[PDB]
Design a protein around this motif. Structure first.
Motif, PDB file in Angstrom:
ATOM      1  N   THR A 168      10.034  22.328 -10.209  1.00 24.97           N
ATOM      2  CA  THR A 168       9.049  21.166 -10.503  1.00 24.97           C
ATOM      3  C   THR A 168       9.007  20.131  -9.268  1.00 24.97           C
ATOM      4  O   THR A 168       9.919  19.870  -8.866  1.00 24.97           O
ATOM      5  CB  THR A 168       9.652  20.440 -11.789  1.00 24.97           C
ATOM      6  OG1 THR A 168       9.727  21.345 -12.851  1.00 24.97           O
ATOM      7  CG2 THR A 168       8.834  19.258 -12.219  1.00 24.97           C
ATOM      8  N   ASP A 169       7.813  20.024  -8.800  1.00 24.90           N
ATOM      9  CA  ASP A 169       7.577  19.238  -7.659  1.00 24.90           C
ATOM     10  C   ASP A 169       6.412  18.454  -8.013  1.00 24.90           C
ATOM     11  O   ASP A 169       5.325  18.401  -8.379  1.00 24.90           O
ATOM     12  CB  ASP A 169       7.199  20.544  -6.591  1.00 24.90           C
ATOM     13  CG  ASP A 169       7.481  19.873  -5.140  1.00 24.90           C
ATOM     14  OD1 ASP A 169       7.896  18.704  -4.815  1.00 24.90           O
ATOM     15  OD2 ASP A 169       7.292  20.788  -4.547  1.00 24.90           O
ATOM     16  N   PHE A 170       6.700  17.268  -7.273  1.00 31.77           N
ATOM     17  CA  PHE A 170       5.685  15.994  -7.285  1.00 31.77           C
ATOM     18  C   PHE A 170       4.852  16.045  -5.762  1.00 31.77           C
ATOM     19  O   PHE A 170       5.442  15.450  -4.850  1.00 31.77           O
ATOM     20  CB  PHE A 170       6.033  14.746  -7.607  1.00 31.77           C
ATOM     21  CG  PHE A 170       6.740  14.619  -8.826  1.00 31.77           C
ATOM     22  CD1 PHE A 170       5.951  14.283 -10.006  1.00 31.77           C
ATOM     23  CD2 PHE A 170       8.254  14.860  -8.954  1.00 31.77           C
ATOM     24  CE1 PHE A 170       6.568  14.307 -11.472  1.00 31.77           C
ATOM     25  CE2 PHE A 170       8.734  14.941 -10.237  1.00 31.77           C
ATOM     26  CZ  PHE A 170       8.029  14.613 -11.374  1.00 31.77           C
ATOM     27  N   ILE A 171       3.825  16.799  -5.813  1.00 34.29           N
ATOM     28  CA  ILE A 171       3.137  17.149  -4.521  1.00 34.29           C
ATOM     29  C   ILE A 171       2.381  16.079  -3.923  1.00 34.29           C
ATOM     30  O   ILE A 171       2.008  16.276  -2.665  1.00 34.29           O
ATOM     31  CB  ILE A 171       2.257  18.407  -4.634  1.00 34.29           C
ATOM     32  CG1 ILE A 171       1.196  18.186  -5.563  1.00 34.29           C
ATOM     33  CG2 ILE A 171       3.262  19.642  -5.303  1.00 34.29           C
ATOM     34  CD1 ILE A 171       0.091  19.335  -5.662  1.00 34.29           C
ATOM     35  N   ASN A 172       1.964  15.057  -4.553  1.00 32.10           N
ATOM     36  CA  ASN A 172       0.971  14.002  -3.898  1.00 32.10           C
ATOM     37  C   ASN A 172       1.939  12.584  -3.384  1.00 32.10           C
ATOM     38  O   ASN A 172       1.430  11.684  -3.096  1.00 32.10           O
ATOM     39  CB  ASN A 172      -0.060  13.540  -4.804  1.00 32.10           C
ATOM     40  CG  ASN A 172       0.583  12.804  -6.001  1.00 32.10           C
ATOM     41  OD1 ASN A 172       1.477  12.768  -6.407  1.00 32.10           O
ATOM     42  ND2 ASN A 172      -0.539  11.844  -6.576  1.00 32.10           N
ATOM     43  N   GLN A 173       3.323  12.900  -3.745  1.00 31.74           N
ATOM     44  CA  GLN A 173       4.273  11.754  -3.422  1.00 31.74           C
ATOM     45  C   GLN A 173       4.927  12.121  -1.712  1.00 31.74           C
ATOM     46  O   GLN A 173       5.082  13.134  -1.609  1.00 31.74           O
ATOM     47  CB  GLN A 173       5.310  11.531  -4.252  1.00 31.74           C
ATOM     48  CG  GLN A 173       4.996  10.894  -5.450  1.00 31.74           C
ATOM     49  CD  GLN A 173       6.071  10.876  -6.381  1.00 31.74           C
ATOM     50  OE1 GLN A 173       7.444  10.780  -6.186  1.00 31.74           O
ATOM     51  NE2 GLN A 173       6.004  11.082  -7.876  1.00 31.74           N
ATOM     52  N   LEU A 180      13.146  19.534  -8.981  1.00 31.04           N
ATOM     53  CA  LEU A 180      13.943  19.943  -9.857  1.00 31.04           C
ATOM     54  C   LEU A 180      13.671  21.423 -10.092  1.00 31.04           C
ATOM     55  O   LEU A 180      12.655  21.880  -9.885  1.00 31.04           O
ATOM     56  CB  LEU A 180      13.541  19.058 -11.324  1.00 31.04           C
ATOM     57  CG  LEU A 180      13.927  19.789 -12.586  1.00 31.04           C
ATOM     58  CD1 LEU A 180      15.716  19.547 -12.586  1.00 31.04           C
ATOM     59  CD2 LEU A 180      13.513  19.266 -13.596  1.00 31.04           C
ATOM     60  N   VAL A 181      14.959  21.846  -9.866  1.00 27.78           N
ATOM     61  CA  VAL A 181      15.220  23.522 -10.470  1.00 27.78           C
ATOM     62  C   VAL A 181      15.841  23.742 -11.585  1.00 27.78           C
ATOM     63  O   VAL A 181      16.891  23.195 -11.697  1.00 27.78           O
ATOM     64  CB  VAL A 181      15.768  24.245  -9.080  1.00 27.78           C
ATOM     65  CG1 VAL A 181      15.714  25.758  -9.478  1.00 27.78           C
ATOM     66  CG2 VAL A 181      14.861  24.140  -7.653  1.00 27.78           C
ATOM     67  N   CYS A 182      15.197  24.557 -12.628  1.00 27.48           N
ATOM     68  CA  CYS A 182      15.648  24.874 -13.864  1.00 27.48           C
ATOM     69  C   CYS A 182      15.922  26.174 -13.839  1.00 27.48           C
ATOM     70  O   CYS A 182      15.077  27.185 -13.639  1.00 27.48           O
ATOM     71  CB  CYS A 182      15.205  24.273 -14.958  1.00 27.48           C
ATOM     72  SG  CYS A 182      14.690  22.396 -15.211  1.00 27.48           S
TER      73      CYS A 182
END
Ligand SMILES: C[S@@+](CC[C@H](N)C(=O)[O-])C[C@H]1O[C@@H](n2cnc3c(N)ncnc32)[C@H](O)[C@@H]1O
Ligand SMILES: C[S@@+](CC[C@H](N)C(=O)[O-])C[C@H]1O[C@@H](n2cnc3c(N)ncnc32)[C@H](O)[C@@H]1O
Lengths: 189, 195
Positions: A168-173, A180-182
Motif C-alpha cells: 500500500t503506497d501513497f503515490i502523490n505524496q 505498508l506491506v501486509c
C-alpha cells in the motif's frame, strides 16, 4: 472518515486479524507502543513476544506496559528478531514490523536488510494460516532507502500459493511517505 | 478472514463512503455489476449515473438492473466517461472506474489513457469533500501496459493537499494482478503555481 497513513492502517489490519487469547509478536519493540497495542487486543489469556536489540528500548517498553497493567502477558526478549524462532514454538496469529530507528534514541542503530529478511522468513514460518504480518517501511535516509529496496525485492519472490503480499503506497505524496506491506499466510508446506 | 483482491477491495472502500440518498457514478458500466452494487447501496432516494460507449454494454446493464428491481434510480448514458460533466451538475459521493475491455465482449474496444485521465479530472472536480474514486486497473494481456503507466503517472501529480491517492498492489503475484487506486478528496479548491 479519512484514509489512514501506513502506520494507522497497520493497526487496523492487526485489529481485523487478532482476537483474544492469540499469540502475537512485536518484532521491533522501540518505545513499546505497538507492544501495548498488541497486549490490549490479546487479553489476559493471550501472549505477546517483544524483541529489541537495545537495553534502552526494552526498559522503556517494560515501563510502558507496567504503567498500563499489561506486563503480565508480554515476554520481552533482548535479542534480534532474526532469532525469533529460538523463543517461540507455537503458531502465531500476527507479527508487527516497524522498520528503521528508535525515536528519541540513537539514530545509528537501525534495522538492517539482512536481519529483516531473516526475521520475515522466520515470521512467515511461525504464522498460522490466516495469520498476518504488517511491515511499516520507512525510507527517508540512505539507510532507510537501502532497506526498502532489499526487503521489497525479497518479498516479490515469496510464493503466491503460500502467501499474499500486499503493498500500500501513497503515490502523490513527497518526502518518502511510509509504505505498508501486509503478508498473509494462505497455505502451508 | 482473507485480504481481498483489488476488485473486492474497491467494493469495500465504496461501502465505507457511500450512504443512502447519495449521488454516485459508475464510469465504466460493462455488464452492470458495479452499477447494481452502487444502486443497492444508494437506495430509493439516491441516484446512480452509468456510462459506457458500447450499445451491448448499455443493454446488458439495463437487463441486469431491471431484473433486480434497481433500474429506477439509475441513469444510463451512452457516452464516454470523459464527458461526465455534461450530464452531472451536483456533487457526487463516489465514482468507480474499472479499466480494460468488456468481459465476454469485443477485446479491442477498451479504455484509453487520454480519455481515462480526462474522466478522472472530471470525476475529481465533481467529487464532494470526503468523497472517493476507486480505479481498478487491469493490464497485460490484450489490454497492454500503456494505460496503467500513464494513468499512474498522471495520478502521482495530483495535489496531496487536495487528494489522497493510495495504490494497492500484490507484489508477489505473477501475471499482472489488477491494481487498486483510491482517490479521496480532502479539500476543496486548487493550488496552481505561478505564471
Ligand atoms: C522504528 S523503531 C520501532 C517503533 C515502535 N513500534 C515504537 O512505537 O516505538 C525500530 C526498532 O527496531 C529495533 N531494531 C533494530 N535492529 C533490530 C534487530 N536486528 N532485531 C530486533 N530489533 C531491532 C531498534 O532498536 C528500534 O527500536
Ligand atoms: C473492464 S470493463 C468494466 C467492467 C464493469 N465494471 C462490469 O461490471 O463488468 C470496461 C468498460 O468500459 C467501457 N469503456 C471503454 N471506453 C470508455 C469510455 N471512454 N467511457 C466510458 N466507458 C468506456 C468498455 O466498453 C467496457 O465496457
Amino acid at each position: 472518515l479519512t484514509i489512514k497513513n501506513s502506520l494507522g492502517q497497520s493497526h487496523d489490519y492487526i485489529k481485523m486479524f487478532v482476537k483474544e487469547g492469540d499469540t502475537v509478536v512485536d518484532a521491533t519493540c522501540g518505545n513499546g507502543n505497538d507492544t501495548a497495542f498488541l497486549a490490549s487486543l490479546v487479553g489476559e489469556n493471550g501472549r505477546v513476544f517483544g524483541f529489541d536489540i537495545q537495553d534502552k528500548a526494552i526498559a522503556n517498553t517494560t515501563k510502558k506496559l507496567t504503567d498500563l497493567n499489561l506486563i503480565d502477558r508480554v515476554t520481552l526478549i533482548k535479542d534480534g528478531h532474526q532469532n525469533m524462532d529460538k523463543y517461540i514454538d507455537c503458531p502465531v496469529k500476527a507479527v508487527m514490523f516497524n522498520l528503521g530507528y528508535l525515536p528519541s534514541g540513537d539514530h545509528s542503530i537501525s534495522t538492517r536488510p539482512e536481519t529483516t529478511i531473516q526475521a520475515l522468513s522466520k515470521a512467515m514460518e511461525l504464522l498460522v494460516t490466516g495469520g498476518i504480518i504488517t511491515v511499516v517501511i520507512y525510507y527517508g535516509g540512505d539507510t532507510g532507502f537501502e532497506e526498502k529496496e532489499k526487503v521489497l525485492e525479497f518479498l516479490k519472490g515469496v510464493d503466491q500459493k503460500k502467501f499474499i503480499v500486499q503493498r500500500t503506497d501513497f503515490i502523490n505524496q513527497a518526502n518518502c511517505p511510509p509504505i505498508l506491506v501486509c503478508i498473509e499466510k494462505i497455505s502451508e508446506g
